[PDB]
Design a protein around this ligand. Structure first.
Ligand SMILES: Nc1nc2c(ncn2[C@@H]2O[C@H](COP(=O)(O)OP(=O)(O)O)[C@@H](O)[C@H]2O)c(=O)[nH]1
Lengths: 82, 703, 85, 205, 62
RNA sequence: AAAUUGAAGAGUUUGAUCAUGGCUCAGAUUGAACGCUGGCGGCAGGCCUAACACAUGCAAGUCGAACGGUAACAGGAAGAAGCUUGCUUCUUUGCUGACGAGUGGCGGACGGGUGAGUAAUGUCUGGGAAACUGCCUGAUGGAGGGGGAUAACUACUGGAAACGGUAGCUAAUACCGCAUAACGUCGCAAGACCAAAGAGGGGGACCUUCGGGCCUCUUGCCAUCGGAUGUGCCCAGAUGGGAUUAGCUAGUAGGUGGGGUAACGGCUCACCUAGGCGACGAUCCCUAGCUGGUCUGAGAGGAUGACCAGCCACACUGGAACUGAGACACGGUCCAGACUCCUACGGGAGGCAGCAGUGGGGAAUAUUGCACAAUGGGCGCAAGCCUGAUGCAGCCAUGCCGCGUGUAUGAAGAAGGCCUUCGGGUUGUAAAGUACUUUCAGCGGGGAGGAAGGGAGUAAAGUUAAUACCUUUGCUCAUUGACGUUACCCGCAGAAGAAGCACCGGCUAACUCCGUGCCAGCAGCCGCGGUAAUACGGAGGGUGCAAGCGUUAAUCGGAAUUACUGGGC
């Protein structure tokens, strides 16, 4: 089940997660088949402080992946209805 | 919340003379409450209170280990109470274990033998109980043995220790006719069952062979209890006997106020009387709150700076009274929660040692087994694990400061020897175990020596150091073969001044510059200058350079500390200086100092100082039975003696003895007076004596 | 054991007994057919094959062996039977 | 971390004037600035090649108040940058917030300027910077953060700030107490007394 | 292996522990190990005032 | 557009030179150690050796929306204790929430630790066919019908402790056979054979044994072909040294046949062939986890596997398999061996290379800490639980970076030190003095962000047959932060509460005096010291570096000193 979750790269008291498509087996920072876009929760003015890659996310979720809660909410946002 | 109200707690101590049956009675109590099967004995080591393997083999309880149970007085065997017994040892060597324990209990059942009555160690723990007014009852153990009597023991306690004992029991049968106990409150005679089946009671009628004496001590108990308060006196004066409940409450108040001591009989080996002693534990000893409220103090002393009491709401305020050595987690600190509630991992501010501590775990005990429990509340003894800074006697509390608990007292050791491991490489691996042991035990002081490189230690008897040396070999696997401490001889001239010089210069071929000084060797009487060195200047010829005179005294200082006799610091010595030679150029003080070296070493040796040996001021207080005998031993040693004054309970005798001889003096002292002597050894003077032991250091190095 | 793996060991042992039983039935019938083959009686052989075929298919569907194992078995036996002629 | 100790000792050992003290009165009337600080300064040391290299680098270091650590980094970067390494080093040395503060005034010497910059009494374009090594970018107002005025030492320093060249990169307002940063100060915009190629060869040795 | 004992005046008996650091002696034949002065009862040289870290002396207070 | 603009030398053999020639030095770097010293802050780092033995607390549970049910807590119903028919609580009652234990399903084979083993069964690079693949997804259908136990239990009996029995039942998605199933399996076909589980949510119709049925919807199950993820297998090449290691190998290499694995295969068996590996190093021996990369280097190259990540092997040692999709399984099984602990003496339990921590080894490396608040992960429909992963914290200058230990002024050049040609020079504007400020740490107040979500109430369509149940989208309301006294801001008094270490003979930057006389001693090489020591030690003074300084160890360079670029007889 290829989960699409956040990877928590970065530093202490300064998260910078990373949207990754990986098997739900491997670790958080672990192996992934691809990463698709980044996310930062303390970016004041940066690249939206958030980015997804909707084409590749569509590729995966259509071919049979799943989506974690944070990546799902981030897509709910990038789809600018809310 | 808490499993039981406070009135169900009874914190009692078991303490007595050696071998009086403390551990046997404790194991019987544990069995009769059911945490132990197989009543077990001690001479076969199988008892569970004994774990350290020394008391397994040697069959002598060496250290206290608290233990809990559920025995009950109201409809006994039901409505359980919490009896926290502390099996303390009774050895004079381990009286420190009694000291800290007696200071941490709210009551304690004293054990007496029916063969000897009180014994010197019991007269000791009696002082250690009056020291804190610890309420207490008596348990006359070993009635089953030959020549054992009860009324004689009662008279013994009445007459010798000074108390008032009242029979709560009278015994049916003395030696082997002992079949049970008759009472003076229930007024019914209990005949216990056969071997190891004494769990039962078989309440039975009082036999007529003892009805009259039972009646006599019954009425005596009645009037002695009515002595507690007025409303118990007139009711009795009206021709009516009080009843069980009010007699029990009145006597119990007497025990609270520390006026009386109750005696119960039994034979912990024939399994008789143990339960009926537990009956007294319940019915008369104070509960944690029945005791007057603990005297807490703030950072300053008042009458009531911190009025603390046993409550689940009161601040957590307790007394860390016992440390223990654990190899696994480092230490293991007992503590008796006087007030409040504390939990695992919770904080605690070490009010005395000026730090905050934490409770990695809180473990209550089954004599060794550390029961893992969440929290401990008031009146409930527990052992804290992991807290680093705390030692014995410290006080642990919340940030609201009942900081000052009253005691910081512990006795002074009397025996001292030195130790040495398999080789002098393991000396730190030895001092480490020594540090652990000295942080665990207050009376035992590891005493690093400065005069020699040996490590000497001090204890309170041949046996205490003996457990320590084996416990060191056993728990800390470094064996130390022992010897005597080295002596501390010294040097100083008698009275006479002797004129001497020492001459040698340097630069005949262009070299650096020289020194030269004349000196005269005057001593002062032993104890004249409190500063061990006194100087008077008399330079008038060949006046040594203006920045060199003080360095001349400071260089003869080296020669003083050197002590050209056998290496020993010369004491009270004085040197006076007259002559020399100089120019208005840069001479060398070091040459004056070597010059002064030759001068010192010749003039002292020819002025004939004295080679003194350490002589200690001794004080010994011993009963009037063996005053002559102990003085005789002292005179056979080197007897110099001070005087004689009759104390209330003995004689005041001081003396002067050599430290070269007082080494093993403690065991011999106590053996000469049954251990009823008190004494401390301290220094008074150094002095000479005709002895051919005076050349050991001279043999190792020097003239 | 210290954990809830005890329940798993117990369930695994129960399943061991059971899978041993079913596997034993399968292999009993397979030895039946192999005897019929080594003998030379073709009609008896095909009878034994039809006796075992539903068992082994049911078992593979039960997962005790794998569909490839059942198919390999039936293939081996059908081939050697038609060779028996 | 800041160089604690005598200042004219440094300036006099290096011989040349490095402005460690406030340029108020004079230098040779207060210290006999021709000879080493030691009692052996009357002697003339020969100062071979490595002598002159260490002396040059120590001159620039004592002028700017940066230490050999973070100075090796001021070489690491400004060598990483494309172009002349010595000139890029002087660029990043000039852009230091203390240097720009002193050069716009506010403090008669680098030490007073650093005490200011570190006492939370400056505001690089609105933001209080307490970092004496804040590398200032071009096009930045310095905004001395009023209530850092009215102490009279910054005023005396602003008075003494003239008789000195108004540097061609500073454009300090001088009276509302701010200052733009037009462009990175050139190497030619500097004293030309300091051989940056000496420092470059010293560190690339 | 062998070992130098630097500094002025040592106190190393037949069974005292010492620490060993590198660095030969360049004139003593075959001695290639300086005894680390001031560690494990191999106490530092006494009455020193310059270069105390090497040779293990406590900084005097004054 | 930038993806680089990057290569230094000296001391040292000789009376002296030149050259080969080795030793050492300045540089960068470290899981570092130790001595001296030591203020803060941020971010990283922390048992390299004994894969040595381990106390203890935790490191894996979840699911009632699978079942029987009721251990505990309650929502509960009827009462004649209590009692003023109860607001002043007695019990039968799984009826409902909820749930001990049990059955069952899913996980436990993940996450995490170590580098012993491993020279090729591996790793990396690039391909391949002889396959599997739970949970995840697309599609297509089925989802008759019934029975046999058994747990829990109950009774009785052991366990004189722990830990087990003999009979009696009763449920389920547990299990078993028949019905059926085909583009599924076998078979050239002909032909035969194959499976399944139900639960939950609502309710208008209508029959009921108030159990429900029934029309719904949400989930779930079986089978079949795909997608994806993970995984198994094969090949070519590289992946340390030693030939003072020249032969090695009978399942050994292959053919045929049988068997076996999910899969191809000497994986195995049985014949038959006599082959196969090898100087391109077979075999043997020592050593070693490989790699992305790290230190260095200008580059080729040298050394290396600390951190983070991928692969592999391992989980007290040796051997084996059981369930399973996945293991030959760290906190599962079983046996042998060692060890440990409990034993009531009849027995039984355990495996820190998980996190903490102990003891031992070492020179050396941390608390028996805080919480799921983020991220995750398992289970669950979800709330919700577990999480020593994780997020944080505590210790240590272990490292990298930033900052301060005040700033200006000041010639009575104070004192005093030291030197001296005896006038003075230098410490030195240095301190004292004078004014200015408060960074940092200390107090006091104020205060972001890490917070996404999920709960209840509500509306829109979507659903049906119902506008009911439920996705799903908004809406309003209370809220979910360990760190934590966060970062930070501002105020409070004062310059206080905060500088050391090494070197100073040439290499090298920094020189004089006293004390020592080949003694004490120093030292990286050259050497210094035997009376005028810039070379020992101290003083003064200076030079470097600065919360470090120095020493040692270690890789590389400089070493064109293994020279392929880049050397010689
Ligand atoms: N006869 C008799 N002997 C006793 C009794 N209690 C203890 N002992 C004996 O005393 C010896 C040691 O007893 P112990 O428990 O060591 O006494 P403790 O040293 O005071 O605890 C054993 O041999 C017992 O047999 C008693 O009540 N009666």
């Amino acid at each position: 089940m290829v989960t699409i979750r956040l990877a928590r790269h970065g530093a202490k008291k300064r998260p910078f997660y990373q949207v990754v498509v990986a098997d739900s087996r491997n670790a958080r920072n672990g192996r992934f088949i691809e990463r698709v876009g980044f996310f930062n929760p303390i970016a004041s003015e940066k690249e939206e402080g958030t980015r997804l890659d909707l084409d590749r996310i569509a590729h995966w979720v259509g071919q049979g992946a799943t989506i974690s809660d944070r990546v799902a909410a981030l897509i709910k946002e990038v789809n600018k209805a809310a | 919340a808490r499993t039981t109200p406070i009135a169900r707690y009874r914190n009692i101590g078991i303490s007595a003379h050696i071998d009086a049956g403390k551990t046997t009675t404790t194991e019987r109590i544990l069995f009769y409450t059911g945490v132990n099967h197989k009543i077990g004995e001690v001479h076969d080591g199988a008892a569970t209170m004994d774990w350290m393997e020394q008391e397994q083999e040697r069959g002598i309880t060496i250290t206290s280990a608290a233990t809990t149970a559920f025995w009950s007085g109201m409809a006994k065997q039901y409505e359980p109470h919490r009896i926290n017994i502390i099996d303390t040892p009774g050895h004079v060597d381990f009286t420190i274990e009694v000291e800290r324990s007696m200071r941490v209990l709210d009551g304690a059942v004293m054990v007496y033998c029916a063969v000897g009555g009180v014994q010197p160690q019991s007269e000791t723990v009696w002082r250690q109980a009056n020291k804190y007014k610890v309420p207490r009852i008596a348990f006359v153990n070993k009635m089953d043995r030959m020549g054992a009597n009860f009324l004689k023991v009662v008279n013994q306690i009445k007459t010798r220790l000074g108390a008032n004992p009242v029979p709560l029991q009278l015994a049916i049968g003395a030696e082997e006719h002992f079949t049970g106990v008759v009472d003076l409150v229930k007024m019914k005679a209990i005949n216990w069952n056969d071997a190891d089946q004494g769990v039962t009671f078989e309440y039975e009628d009082i036999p007529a062979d003892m009805v009259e004496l039972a009646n006599e001590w019954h009425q005596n108990l009645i009037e002695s209890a009515a002595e507690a308060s007025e409303e118990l006196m007139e009711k009795y004066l009206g021709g009516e006997e009080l009843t069980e409940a009010e007699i029990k409450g009145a006597l119990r108040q007497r025990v609270l106020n520390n006026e009386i001591i109750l005696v119960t009989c039994g034979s912990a080996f024939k399994n008789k009387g143990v339960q009926a002693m537990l009956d007294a534990v319940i019915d008369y000893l104070p509960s944690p709150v029945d005791v007057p409220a603990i005297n807490g103090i703030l950072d300053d002393g008042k009458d009531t700076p911190a009025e603390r009491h046993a409550s689940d709401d009161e601040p957590f305020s307790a007394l860390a009274f016992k440390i223990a050595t654990d190899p696994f987690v480092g230490n293991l600190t007992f503590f008796r929660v006087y007030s409040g509630v504390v939990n695992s991992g919770d904080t605690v501010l070490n009010s005395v040692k000026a730090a905050r501590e934490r409770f990695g775990r809180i473990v209550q005990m089954h004599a060794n087994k550390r029961e893992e429990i969440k929290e401990v509340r008031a009146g409930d003894i527990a052992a804290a694990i992991g807290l680093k800074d705390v030692t014995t006697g410290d006080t642990l509390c919340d940030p609201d400061a009942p900081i000052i608990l009253e005691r910081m007292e512990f006795p002074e050791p009397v025996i001292s020897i030195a130790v040495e491991p398999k080789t002098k490489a393991d000396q730190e691996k030895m001092g480490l175990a020594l540090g652990r042991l000295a942080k665990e035990d207050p009376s035992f002081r590891v005493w690093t020596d400065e005069e020699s490189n040996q490590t000497i230690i001090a204890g309170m008897g041949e046996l205490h150091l003996d457990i320590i040396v084996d416990r060191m070999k056993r728990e800390f696997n470094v064996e130390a073969n022992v010897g005597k401490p080295q002596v501390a001889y010294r040097e100083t001239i008698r009275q006479k001044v002797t004129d001497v010089e020492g001459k040698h210069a340097k630069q005949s071929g262009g070299r650096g510059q020289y020194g030269h000084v004349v000196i005269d060797m005057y001593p002062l009487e032993p104890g004249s200058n409190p500063k061990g060195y006194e100087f008077i200047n008399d330079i008038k010829g060949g006046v040594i350079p203006g920045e060199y005179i003080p360095a001349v005294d400071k260089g003869i200082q080296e020669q003083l500390k050197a002590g050209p006799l056998a290496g020993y610091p010369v004491v009270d010595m004085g040197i006076r200086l007259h002559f020399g030679s100089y120019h208005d150029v840069d001479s060398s003080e070091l040459a004056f100092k070597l010059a002064a070296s030759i001068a010192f070493k010749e003039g002292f040796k020819k002025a004939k100082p004295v080679l003194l040996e350490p002589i200690m001021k001794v004080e010994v207080e011993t009963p009037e039975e063996n005053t002559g005998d102990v003085i005789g031993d002292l005179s056979r040693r080197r007897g110099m003696l001070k005087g004689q004054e009759s104390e209330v309970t003995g004689v005041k005798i001081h003396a002067e003895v050599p430290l070269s001889e007082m080494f093993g003096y403690a065991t011999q002292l106590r053996s000469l007076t049954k251990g009823r002597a008190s004494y401390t050894m301290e220094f008074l003077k150094y002095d000479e004596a005709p002895s051919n032991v005076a050349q050991a250091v001279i043999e190792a190095r020097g003239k | 054991n210290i954990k809830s793996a005890k329940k798993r060991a117990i369930q695994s042992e129960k399943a061991r007994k059971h899978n041993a039983s079913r596997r034993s039935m399968m292999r009993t019938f397979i030895k039946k057919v192999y005897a019929a083959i080594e003998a030379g009686d073709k009609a008896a052989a095909q009878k034994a094959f039809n006796e075992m075929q539903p068992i082994v298919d049911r078992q593979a569907a039960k997962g005790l062996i794998h569909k490839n194992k059942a198919a390999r078995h039936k293939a081996n036996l059908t081939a050697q039977i038609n060779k028996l002629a | 971390a800041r160089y604690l100790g005598p200042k004219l000792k440094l300036s006099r050992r290096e011989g040349t004037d490095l402005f460690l003290k406030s340029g108020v009165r004079a230098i040779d009337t207060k210290c006999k600035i021709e000879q080493a600080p030691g009692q052996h300064g009357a002697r003339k040391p020969r100062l071979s090649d490595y002598g002159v290299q260490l002396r040059e680098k120590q001159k620039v270091r004592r002028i700017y108040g940066v230490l050999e650590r973070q100075f090796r980094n001021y070489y690491k970067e400004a060598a990483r940058l494309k172009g002349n390494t010595g000139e890029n080093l002087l660029a990043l040395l000039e852009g230091r917030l203390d240097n720009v503060v002193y050069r716009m005034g506010f403090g008669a010497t680098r030490a007073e300027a650093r005490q200011l910059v570190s006492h939370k009494a400056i505001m690089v374009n609105g933001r209080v910077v307490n970092i004496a090594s804040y590398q200032v970018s071009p096009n930045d107002v310095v905004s001395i953060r009023e209530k850092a005025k009215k102490q009279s030492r910054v005023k005396a320093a602003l008075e003494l700030a003239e008789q000195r060249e108004k540097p061609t990169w500073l454009e300090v307002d001088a009276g509302k107490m701010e200052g733009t940063f037009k462009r990175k100060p050139e190497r030619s915009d500097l004293s030309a007394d300091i051989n940056e190629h000496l420092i470059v060869e010293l560190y690339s040795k | 292996v062998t070992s130098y004992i630097g500094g002025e005046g040592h106190n190393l008996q037949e069974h005292s522990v010492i620490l060993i650091r590198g660095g030969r002696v360049k004139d003593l034949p075959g001695v290639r190990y300086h005894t680390v002065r001031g560690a494990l009862d191999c106490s530092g040289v006494k009455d020193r005032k310059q270069a105390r870290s090497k040779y293990g002396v406590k900084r005097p207070k004054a």
